[PDB]
Each structure stands twice: as C-alpha cells, then as structure tokens.
Design a binder for this molecule. Sequence first.
Ligand SMILES: *[C@@H]1O[C@H](CO)[C@@H](O)[C@H](O)[C@H]1NC(C)=O
Ligand SMILES: [Cl-]
Ligand SMILES: [Cl-]
Ligand SMILES: [Cl-]
Ligand SMILES: [Cl-]
Ligand SMILES: [Cl-]
Ligand SMILES: [Cl-]
Ligand SMILES: [Cl-]
Ligand SMILES: [Cl-]
Ligand SMILES: [Cl-]
Ligand SMILES: [Cl-]
Ligand SMILES: [Cl-]
Ligand SMILES: [Cu+2]
Ligand code: NA
Length: 235
Amino acid sequence: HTLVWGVWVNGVDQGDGRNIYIRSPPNNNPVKNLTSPDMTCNVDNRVVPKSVPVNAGDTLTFEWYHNTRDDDIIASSHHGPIAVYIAPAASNGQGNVWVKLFEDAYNVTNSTWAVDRLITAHGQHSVVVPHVAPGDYLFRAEIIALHEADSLYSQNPIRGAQFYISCAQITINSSDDSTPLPAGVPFPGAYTDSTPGIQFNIYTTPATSYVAPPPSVWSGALGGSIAQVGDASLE
Ligand SMILES: *[C@@H]1O[C@H](CO)[C@@H](O)[C@H](O)[C@H]1NC(C)=O
Ligand SMILES: [Cl-]
Ligand SMILES: [Cl-]
Ligand SMILES: [Cl-]
Ligand SMILES: [Cl-]
Ligand SMILES: [Cl-]
Ligand SMILES: [Cl-]
Ligand SMILES: [Cl-]
Ligand SMILES: [Cl-]
Ligand SMILES: [Cl-]
Ligand SMILES: [Cl-]
Ligand SMILES: [Cl-]
Ligand SMILES: [Cu+2]
Ligand code: NA
C-alpha cells in the first residue's frame, strides 16, 4: 500500500505533486485486475493541472510513501519488482504505447528484492530522461507486490499480484530526439495470467528463479536505479 508523493529532478525536489502533476488515486489500495482500465494509470486517470519540466539526460526521481511522506514506504514483507514506463501524453495511455525504461526485480548479491531496496532508499527511484521528441509525456511507475501472487486474481479475486501504479505528467523540453520512442505495449493488456512474473510463489520458489514480466527495457533507455537522491526531512 504505497503512493507517489512527488518527484525530484537532478536532486531537486519538485514539491508535493499529488493531484497536481501526479494523477493520484484517492488512496493506496492496489490494482489487481489485469484487464481493467485501472492498470493504465490507476483508478482516477484524468489530466491534472501541472506537468514537470525536464531535459533529456536529467535524473527524474519518483518518491513513494505509505501514509505520510518518508515513512516506512511500503510493508517490507511485500516483496516484488519495480518498473518505469513512458508513453506520449497524446495517447492518454491507450494503445500500444508503453515503453519500458527501467526494471529491477531480485538482486542476487545483496539478496534483496526491489521493494526492499526502495524502503532503504526512502521511497526513491530514478530514471534518466531519454532522447525522445520534445513534448508531453506520461511516466508510469509500477510496483508489484507478490505476497499473494501464488494465486491469480482472475481465478480468486481475493488474492493475486498487487499493482501500485502512478502516472506523472512530464514535459521534455530540451532533447535532440536522437532516439525517437519505439512502439509500446498496452496497459491493460501486456500482463496476462500466463505472463512470467505475475503468478509466482515467493515462499517456495527461489528468488533467483524469478523472472519479471516483459517487456524488456528499451535499448534507448539511459539508465536508472533505486537509491535515495534527496533528504525529505530537509527539502
Ligand atoms: C476486471 O475488469 C474487466 C474489464 O474492465 C471487468 O469486465 C471485470 O468485471 C473485472 N473483474 C472484476 C472481478 O471486477
Ligand atoms: Cl503491499
Ligand atoms: Cl512541497
Ligand atoms: Cl482491481
Ligand atoms: Cl482527462
Ligand atoms: Cl504527507
Ligand atoms: Cl539508498
Ligand atoms: Cl486468502
Ligand atoms: Cl539531447
Ligand atoms: Cl514516435
Ligand atoms: Cl487486457
Ligand atoms: Cl536498482
Ligand atoms: Cu499493500
Ligand atoms: Na487479499
């Protein structure tokens, strides 16, 4: 149960974005229905009044929280992967438009899931803004919690993978457009009951065997990481 508070750009806090530049839902409940329009940008998908200006090569950091800013972020138990996608704003997230910029699932050396690393990072994870066409974009951050993913929602609606989905409105100003955005996957649609990583038993299957849901990260992606970039208690 987690939500995005706002973003940082190059280590600078852009301020509380909730219902301002983040298309925030009313609470931290998960989305579970893989075929629902809620998979696109969560349950209150509408244009919000502001959009954060960035340039290609900038570091864009999502900052998540549970109940209040810089709290425990999400239950540590609730192990799973994190991804970030981009699409053009003109789509409103419809169609084959979502391109993957980042993926983290399980790290074998530290024996840590992305969710646990996120807690350590005080809710912060980042992508480097790619060299796409200048214009308006949606960046869709997605956390999948797997604690009930030994079942499928479609078969048992009281269980299933849990999706915490947040869309930020981002305006890319300076960019040479040298890696124009390729075709994307649809949400809903990309994830189905047979997709690797959707149904998994984290209690009995080794984490080293986990495979995150495709698609793979776009070759045009410029980087990203789960790591604290700024201190919320100060800025
Ligand atoms: C899941 O979403 C689909 C598409 O909107 C909808 O038809 C179906 O009723 C939903 N399932 C449940 C259990 O609400
Ligand atoms: Cl959770
Ligand atoms: Cl603020
Ligand atoms: Cl749902
Ligand atoms: Cl709208
Ligand atoms: Cl708060
Ligand atoms: Cl960190
Ligand atoms: Cl149950
Ligand atoms: Cl550039
Ligand atoms: Cl394009
Ligand atoms: Cl679908
Ligand atoms: Cl990472
Ligand atoms: Cu939860
Ligand atoms: Na449940």
